[PDB]
Amino acid sequence: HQALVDQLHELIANTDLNKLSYLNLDAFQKRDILAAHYIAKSAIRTKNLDQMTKAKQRLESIYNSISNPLHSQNN
Ligand code: NA
Ligand code: NA
Ligand code: NA
Numbered sequence: 001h002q003a004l005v006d007q008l009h010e011l012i013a014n015t016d017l018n019k020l021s022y023l024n025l026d027a028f029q030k031r032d033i034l035a036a037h038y039i040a041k042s043a044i045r046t047k048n049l050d051q052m053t054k055a056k057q058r059l060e061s062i063y064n065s066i067s068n069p070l071h072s073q074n075n
Contacts, residue, residue, distance in 0.1 A: 004052050008040045011059035015066070024072035029062075036062060 015033050025033075036058050043051035 001047075001049060001052065004049075004056060005044055008044060008052060008056055008059065011056065011063060012037050012040055014063055015059060020066065023066050023069055025066055025069070029066065033062060033066075 015037070017030055017033060036055065039051065040055035040059060043055050
């Protein structure tokens with residue numbers, strides 16, 4: 001499952017909070033991202049397939065979401 005590991009690494013890199021200022025993500029989204037990275041990394045480290053698979057779907061969803069995001073407004 002090296003392909004899945006490579007996919008996760010790419011997704012983690014593409015959801016680097018340091019490069020996402022321009023998207024105006026709220027605290028909840030950023031916490032989702034930090035959690036997803038930790039889960040993905042921990043699943044790779046332990047070679048847990050179900051968790052690696054879940055982590056990929058979660059990160060794919062996040063990446064698509066924040067790349068087509070909800071307009072930032074205070075109401
Ligand atoms: Na921000
Ligand atoms: Na929370
Ligand atoms: Na299973």
